[PDB]
Amino acid sequence: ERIRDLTSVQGVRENSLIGYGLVVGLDGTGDQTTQTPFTTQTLNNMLSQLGITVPTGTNMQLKNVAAVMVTASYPPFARQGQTIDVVVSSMGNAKSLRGGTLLMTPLKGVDSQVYALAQGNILVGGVNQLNGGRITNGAIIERELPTQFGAGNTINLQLNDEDFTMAQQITDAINRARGYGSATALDARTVQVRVPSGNSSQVRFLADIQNMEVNVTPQDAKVVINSRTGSVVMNREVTLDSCAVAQGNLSVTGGSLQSVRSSANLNSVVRALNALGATPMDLMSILQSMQSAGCLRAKLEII
Amino acid sequence: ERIRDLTSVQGVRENSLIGYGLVVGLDGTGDQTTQTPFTTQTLNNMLSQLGITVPTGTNMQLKNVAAVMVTASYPPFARQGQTIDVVVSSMGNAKSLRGGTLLMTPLKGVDSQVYALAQGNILVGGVNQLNGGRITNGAIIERELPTQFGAGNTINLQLNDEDFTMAQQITDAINRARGYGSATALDARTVQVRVPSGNSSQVRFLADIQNMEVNVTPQDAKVVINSRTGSVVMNREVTLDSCAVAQGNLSVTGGSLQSVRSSANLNSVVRALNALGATPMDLMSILQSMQSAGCLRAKLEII
Amino acid sequence: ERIRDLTSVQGVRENSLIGYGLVVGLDGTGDQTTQTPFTTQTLNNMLSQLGITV
Amino acid sequence: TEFIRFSGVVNPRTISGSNSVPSTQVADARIEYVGNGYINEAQNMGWLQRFFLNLSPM
């Protein structure tokens, strides 16, 4: 059950759908409608569609209606009649969408075609975000996408992370499990697999391939630094080289220059860095300086 | 009783109905009708339909009437005379709908045709939402939709979640229960089933298929993060890789860098992450950083 | 496992992508839109694309 | 009788919320405003005067 966790099947992908709607039933926490003319304009549009023509010159000050944007994911092999979850986000000067209801909303694709229709009740946590909510099974699929699955005798497994070693390992595992020339590698990210012609046979082949177990070879050493959240993460391949480190208000537990020993595994690296007595914000600067000097034998990525 | 919980039958789907109405009988908690002209306009329309013509130039300031939007679900194989539940949501500057009554409301479809008529008494909880309510059996079905069920010898079971393994498992279960070529797989989401021609025979076939038991194969590892509600959910397939984690105000229970051991099952992952002593909001950043680094062997989805 | 940590393969490189967007669902902590005309301009563009002409 | 005829090509996104578009946003705009009756014939040059206007030396 590792191949399904390391790769994705070519043609089996997700799309993004967007749409505009109105959320009603709020407890006076909707749009002001004086700074958001589109709310009243679209409410008048809906009323006109339903058979009510409000005169153009009239002041409408609503409190229970909010103009919202609805986002959804079009799943692979989606069929009409199926339901998907949607996210509803306020667009202007609304206060809350706690007990609102989303009216009929057409969800358009990138090609500006309706692929789903959204309508349901919003669930809002209520420190919690008030202007955003989620509706489970809130949209029904209305259009279906053609696909080439089942045509041809080749399917590509696309690795989540590029690696020649992992691509070769997956290819060798498939060849060890299902014949000599069952899988070949095209690059560091794509493995081409030969499958029998048809739909059911390819589904069977993919079902056998997906749950296969592949031992993950060691990746590249990498230290991920998030300055916006104040976090540091080091994987198991990080090593250290011996060198001296000095930083403000940090001293030997003594002098301001502290030795850092040569470290081979991650436990040694953690011990050496904890001997410094550094706050993670200080550890960020220490790690960047050590990468500049050359002690840190890892790829420092700031995210 | 698992196939009915994993799939849906093609053509057996639900539609969405919308309509406009007026809710009367409120205790002075209705529309102000000065900022909502459509309430008074539609009340005048109703009175004119009933035989009362209020002169055009007249000031009407009501307090017990609220303009509302009514939403409903059209069930599969709906027949005229059947009753469905409706949701009633205020539209503008109304305060409460606690003891209101919904007048005759036609529920239109996407094609702007009346499929149901709604009228009844609203139930409002009364921290509780006041501008939204529900009426059980509040709408009577008036129109029926044609369908192709019972025609042809093919019916498609559509999986809620796409999976080649689950599609193959359902196909194999149906073939094991009801003959050799009873079911075939078309893609990761659809299983085609051969049924005898007719209506009663297909109902019998679907009744036997629906309650069948299928052992669910393990899905993809997935960590769901909800920042708006502040929640994290990890399924049973999540594993961890050994690496060091540092974050603000978190330290060894000591140094700011804490080791996280390699974890195979979910209990080990939970133990390793609880050893960090992290608040769930801190756990969100920790998990994102670990996914960036590569310790987290799961798909991180933010909902 | 050191050569992969000391070198990079020719042609196996990363590129940089940039784009403009709108972020909605904020709790009154968004743009003022009086000092940022492009926010309202692009919101109107999106609404016009979706079928609403303000 | 007066006739006002219009023809052209309209971009859908130029149409306003009240289903209106100004005539300056229409690509191949053909606008015609004509009439008949003796009022319209009173605004036509005589044939001799037109002949002179086209063929006179000055």
Swiss-Prot record, chain C:
Coiled-coil annotated residue ranges, if any: none
Taxonomically, the superkingdom here is Bacteria
Q: Where in the cell is it found?
A: Periplasm; Bacterial flagellum basal body
Role summary: Assembles around the rod to form the L-ring and probably protects the motor/basal body from shearing forces during rotation.
Into which family does the record put it? Belongs to the FlgI family.
Per UniProt, subunit arrangement is: The basal body constitutes a major portion of the flagellar organelle and consists of four rings (L,P,S, and M) mounted on a central rod.
This protein is called what?
Flagellar P-ring protein
According to its UniProt entry, this protein's organism is: Salmonella typhimurium (strain LT2 / SGSC1412 / ATCC 700720)
Q: Which gene encodes it?
A: flgI
Section covered of the full-length record: 20 to 73 of 365
Curated annotation (Swiss-Prot), chain D:
Give the species. Salmonella typhimurium (strain LT2 / SGSC1412 / ATCC 700720)
Q: Which family does it belong to?
A: Belongs to the FlgH family.
Task: Describe, as the record does, how this protein assembles with itself and its partners.
Answer: The basal body constitutes a major portion of the flagellar organelle and consists of four rings (L,P,S, and M) mounted on a central rod.
Localization, per the record, is: Cell outer membrane; Bacterial flagellum basal body
**Taxonomically, which superkingdom?**
Bacteria
| Name the record gives this protein | Flagellar L-ring protein
In the record, what lineage is assigned to the organism producing the protein? Bacteria, Pseudomonadati, Pseudomonadota, Gammaproteobacteria, Enterobacterales
Q: By which gene is this protein encoded?
A: flgH
Task: Give the function comment from the record.
Answer: Assembles around the rod to form the L-ring and probably protects the motor/basal body from shearing forces during rotation.
